Amino acid sequence: ASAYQRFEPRAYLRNNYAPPRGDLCNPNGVGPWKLRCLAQTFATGEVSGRTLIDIGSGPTVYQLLSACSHFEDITMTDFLEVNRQELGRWLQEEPGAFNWSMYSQHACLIEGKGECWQDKERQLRARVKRVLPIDVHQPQPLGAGSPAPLPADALVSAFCLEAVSPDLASFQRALDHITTLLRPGGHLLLIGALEESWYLAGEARLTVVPVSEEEVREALVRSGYKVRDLRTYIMPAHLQTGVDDVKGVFFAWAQKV
Ligand SMILES: Nc1ncnc2c1ncn2[C@@H]1O[C@H](CSCC[C@H](N)C(=O)O)[C@@H](O)[C@H]1O
Ligand SMILES: NC[C@H](O)c1cccc(C(F)(F)F)c1
């Protein structure tokens, strides 16, 4: 976890959200697939409410695109200052912010409601009230008196848990921890890597717990969830780039019962 102190956001983003992986043009790529999972899931309109929290946002927003048109109060979080600062930059349209425009576009394309992407971003920025520090290893991961209206009506988290946890049980506790933030009857949309064990981000070389679809399911159940959907994307050769050793990406829609 002290490895995360050398974590370089610009190199993360570059490694994982710029082309090839960041070229949204081929619909068989991983970005289109993630974006579509979120989109489909919300267009069901069974995931709805007033507040929502992004767990381990790091320096990224795509995970909230389709989401943001359904929850008026959206809280973002990450363990690192540097990331909370990089999010700041895009939220406030400051100089040198990252360019998500491609992602916004495709969310708009995928949702098919004829929305322009500036309207979409405009809505996201507007609905993101706060960026908060977070440690999922803590049993109240946000702290005590957090500005975050609890309990949240829903949780979103991508590539965090399995990437902050040294092992399967550790991963499992973290899940219990965040689940604490989620109002009962509420919804969790979880996206992560499958059987990934390391991934780079500049100088920082991070270790990952290689989980599996079955492990992830059991884990969601153990933590008190009803699994409404679990889907798997197998990484194609040409998206294997040596910034990691990820084999697939998984997406899960789970309802706390
Ligand atoms: N103990 C911890 N608790 C919560 N987040 C942590 C953490 N330790 C590291 N992190 C954060 O977990 C993030 C993993 S990278 C994930 C970024 C983004 N959600 C995506 O879809 O790409 C990093 O931003 C990192 O800072
Ligand atoms: N967990 C970090 C990992 O390198 C990662 C982040 C985002 C996307 C992807 C991938 F493209 F699915 F491999 C991997």
Swiss-Prot record:
EC number(s) reported in the record: 2.1.1.28
Gene Ontology BP, a term: methylation
Annotated GO MF terms: phenylethanolamine N-methyltransferase activity
Top-level taxon of the source organism: Eukaryota
Pathways involved: Catecholamine biosynthesis; (R)-adrenaline biosynthesis; (R)-adrenaline from (R)-noradrenaline: step 1/1
Pfam families: NNMT_PNMT_TEMT
Claim: Phosphoprotein is one of the keywords in the record: yes
UniProt entry keywords in alphabetical sequence: Catecholamine biosynthesis, Methyltransferase, Phosphoprotein, S-adenosyl-L-methionine, Transferase
Activation/inhibition comment: Inhibited by methyl methanethiosulfonate, phenylglyoxal, tetranitromethane and diethyl pyrocarbonate. Inhibited by 4-oxo-1,4-dihydro-quinoline-3,7-dicarboxylic acid, 4-(benzo[d][1,3]dioxol-5-ylamino)-4-oxobutanoic acid and 1,4-diaminonaphthalene-2,6-disulfonic acid.
Residues at which octopamine binds: E196, D244
Transmembrane segments: none
InterPro entries cross-referenced by the UniProt entry: NNMT/PNMT/TEMT_CS, NNMT_TEMT_trans, SAM-dep_methyltransferase, SAM-dependent_MTases_sf
Residue sites binding S-adenosyl-L-methionine per the record: Y12, Y17, G56, S57, Y62, D78, N83, D135, V136, A158
Catalyzed reactions: phenylethanolamine + S-adenosyl-L-methionine = N-methylphenylethanolamine + S-adenosyl-L-homocysteine + H(+); (R)-noradrenaline + S-adenosyl-L-methionine = (R)-adrenaline + S-adenosyl-L-homocysteine + H(+); (R)-normetanephrine + S-adenosyl-L-methionine = (R)-metanephrine + S-adenosyl-L-homocysteine + H(+); (R)-octopamine + S-adenosyl-L-methionine = (R)-synephrine + S-adenosyl-L-homocysteine + H(+)
Effect of substituting T75A: Significant decrease in protein expression and enzyme activity with octopamine as substrate
Phenotype upon changing E162 to A/Q: Strongly reduced enzyme activity towards phenylethanolamine. Increases affinity for S-adenosyl-L-methionine
S-adenosyl-L-methionine in keyword set: yes
GO terms for cellular component: cytosol
CDD domains: AdoMet_MTases
NCBIfam families: GntF_guanitoxin
Its biological purpose: Catalyzes the transmethylation of nonepinephrine (noradrenaline) to form epinephrine (adrenaline), using S-adenosyl-L-methionine as the methyl donor. Other substrates include phenylethanolamine and octopamine. Also methylates normetanephrine.
Family under the similarity heading: Belongs to the class I-like SAM-binding methyltransferase superfamily. NNMT/PNMT/TEMT family.
Name this polypeptide is given: Phenylethanolamine N-methyltransferase
Encoding gene (name): PNMT
